[PDB]
Structures are given as C-alpha cells and as structure tokens.
Symmetry: C3
Subunit: 183 residues, 3 copies
C-alpha cells in the first residue's frame, strides 16, 4: 500500500481551460510513500484542440489545482483533476503534503511551499526540446472549509518564438519530485 | 529484493564506440523498486582513449541501448551494456519500464516515451561545469523479437567551444529519474 | 526505521558564516533508505541578517560540511550542522551514509565521481522571479580528523548578472532532490 495514482494511461481526467464542458487533458500522477517522503512523478498530455494550440504562441501557462479533504480524498468539484486518485492494488492521508512542513499561509510570504524545476516539450516538426518551467505549490492557499491539503502544478512556456505554428499534441516530459509527507 | 544494478564501481562493462573490440566505458546504473515506480541513478565513466577524447570537440553524443527479454534479463549481444545486471543481495521483470505507460511504437510519435534532463561534466583544468543534455527513451523501439523491454540513455554535448583540448577522463555526474514500472 | 533527518521545520541548526557565534540558518535534510540508495531532500532557510543580505550581491556561495563518525553519527564540532540528525520514529545510522566504495576518500585532485550537481531556485521578494542556484553535493572525498568516517558537503552558488535583492530578505533555497549509493 505504497502508491496513490491516476492509473496508467488514463482517459481524459482534468480540465485545463477556464470554462470547458469536457475534460481536455490526461494527467499522469504517481505518488509513492518512501519513508518520511513522498516520491512523485507527473506528466500531462493535451486532449482538446484548444489545449493543443496553446503552444502556437510564444508564452503559455497551464495550472492544475488539486484539493483534498481531511481523509486525503480528492475534492472533485473544486479541483482541476476530475477523477479521484486510487491505490495501485485496491485514508490516503499518509500521501498528503505535511501541513507542518508546508503550512497554509495568512500572508503572501509562501516561498517555502514551492518546488521548482524544468521539464521539456518535444516539437512536432524537427523534434527540438523546449524548456517548460514547472512549479509545484504545496498547501499554502485554501478556497473552502472542506480543504485540508492541496497540490498545485503549474507549467509555463516562455520562449522567444512559438514551439508550433499549428495544432499538435501537447505533452510534458515526466517531472520528478519529493516532499515531506503527512503523519 | 528491491535493487537491480551494475554493482558499485564496476569494471569496463559497456561499449560506446561502434566497432570497438573492448569495453570502453564504465556504466553505473541503479534501479530501485519504489511502489509503482522505479527510482533510477545513472552515471558514466570513460575508459578508452577514444572515449576520453570525445570532449576534445564542441559537440559529442553518447548512446547506450539496453534491451531485455521477457524475464527482464539483459540481452547482451544486442545491447551496449555487455555485463548483465544483478540484485544487491543474492526476477527482474518487476524493474522494467511498463509497456502500458511506455509502449513500443509503430507510429513516429514517441514523445511520451522520453525522459529529459541535464547532468554535468567537470573540466580537467579549472573544474568548470559543462552541461550535458541527457535523454532516456523507454521502450518505443525493438530491433528484434527477443526484445520485451528497452532502456536507452543518450548524453549530448553541445557547447560553443570544446571542454578539453587533450585527453581527459570522461565522467557524467549522476542523473536521477523515475518511471512507471511493469506489473 | 527508514528515515534520518533534521526534523520538520527545525530551529536554527547550522552555521553558514564560519566564524559566527549563533546558528544562522535552518537546514532541512531528509535521508531515506531505498533499497541500495538513499533518497535525499535538502532545503535551506537563512536566519541572521548577514545570511539574508548575501543575495544583495550578484554572486554568493554557501557551504555546509557534514562529518560523521564510524557509527554514522554527526560530528558536531567539525561540522556546519550543529544539531545531530535523528530517526523519524519517536543503534546505527551507518546504513544512511554515502558508500565509501562508490565515493572514496581521495589523496589527489581527480574526484569528479564524488560530486552530484544540479539546480534549485530562489524566489525574489520583489516580483517573485526565479533565480537559479547551482547546487553541488560532494560525498566523502575529504577528511579533516581521525574520527571522520563519512562526509556530505552541500554547496549553493549564486552567479547572476545582477543582484537578486537590493535589501535584506529571507534567504530560501527550493528543495533539491538527490540519490546516492549507500553504505553496507
Ligand atoms: Na472527497
Ligand atoms: Na486547515
């Protein structure tokens, strides 16, 4: 009982664009209990035409907010992820980011709640690697009384010229991370 | 049984140069089962004069292709790694990259099969850090029907000027990665 | 018992400025036994005014050297970390140490293989711009006492075209993740 995840190769399970009716992204997320940490793995594939045209511009931003109740279960209504996580062979509380290490803030000082790094996009044409700034915010903000934990992923494209000129499957190469886990 | 590796500080065990008669590199590779993922660690040391003069130019590329049969055992003839992996204390299928998450491709779009990142080379003179693009291709391609799994490492040097002007031990700083594992 | 760490959100527990009287930094370090490796997590928060003005310049360097005896216990006098590590569950920490075979103590200057290299980030107080910090971890390689059996050295380097801050601000380094081959 070490793994909390989206399952492998999930059907569209999340909503990237502001007001969309349909899930427009496939989020792959794996969380593994490893002593006092969680080991993490995250990658994203775009589904809708709107998502898959975002890299038609030189800048772009994708944000997925996940909120969990006190039992560590996904709050579907509030979250961008619309399908609950599950165990690999089956109180997901033990997978959650620690509220001590990453507390909810009553001010804008929040630097210690962030993980920062880089993953990559492969262009469709010549297969160039385009850097994407990835930041993960742990807890920090809350939007309702039902929220006990939170994980926010944000990818940023910031290039001198657009990676694509036409529609193409948006993919983000896997990003690896750890954080101090709850209880 | 939770570790599959080359052993610590192995002898020359891999073949970087095409037609070489002798193993010309020491590959250190550690794969650890961690819930639904494998945690990986990989670094390379050059042995032959040819390898240790590659960084005498401003661009260079090193590619190690590992192929495994259906039991997760190294296919020595086909691979660049010439010495089979082993456990830390002594049954390798469970260490392999998942064929569901990283399938073999008959299309051309193998974007989702790649891990990308950066490690570093320390120059012999002032010990300045030179960036190396590292990409790991999981599965995707199979040269032979014996092959059930594959892991490919590729280091790229792409500098404005050559890191060295003479022979010097090629070393790549350890690169860390995870991937979704089989069964 | 798989975790050796500083505890969560520790008090000032290390010394960035060599010759200071008081602990001037909070080091968060987590080491987890994972088969043949240790999985690592490290981040730093500055405490003193001196530390929190370092990023007032365009270049800066922070070095923390940890030394351990043959039992894997912190040598407090020799180290920059002044508070001993402990297990998560509240007599060997040897199994958490960097392998002396994979990362040996040397007698010359050809020790590339003892180094881990990577990047973490500083968030500026002004517009929250991300400033890159070169992080390098040296395993073993060096002794400075008959009692040193293992060593871990963390070094952060700021090297920018202009200074991240113009005034005092809390120095923080975003978490850096690493693995190494562990002892026994
Ligand atoms: Na719920
Ligand atoms: Na709360």
């Amino acid at each position: 009982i070490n793994t909390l995840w989206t399952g492998i190769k999930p059907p569209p399970n999340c909503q990237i664009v502001e007001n969309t009716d349909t899930n427009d992204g496939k989020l792959t997320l794996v969380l593994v209990k490893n002593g006092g940490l969680v080991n993490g793995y995250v990658s994203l594939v775009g589904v809708s035409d709107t998502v898959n045209q975002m890299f038609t511009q030189k800048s772009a931003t994708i944000q997925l907010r996940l909120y969990f109740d006190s039992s560590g279960n996904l709050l579907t209504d509030e979250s961008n992820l619309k399908i609950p996580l599950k165990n690999k062979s089956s109180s997901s509380k033990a997978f959650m980011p620690s509220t001590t290490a990453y507390p909810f803030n009553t001010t804008t000082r929040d630097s210690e709640n962030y993980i920062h790094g880089i993953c990559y996009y492969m262009t469709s044409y010549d297969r160039s690697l385009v850097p994407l700034n990835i930041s993960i915010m742990l807890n920090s903000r809350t939007i309702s009384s039902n929220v006990a934990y939170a994980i926010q992923f944000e990818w940023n494209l910031n290039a001198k010229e657009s990676p694509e000129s036409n529609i193409a499957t948006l993919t983000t190469s896997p990003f690896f991370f750890s954080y101090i886990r709850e209880d």
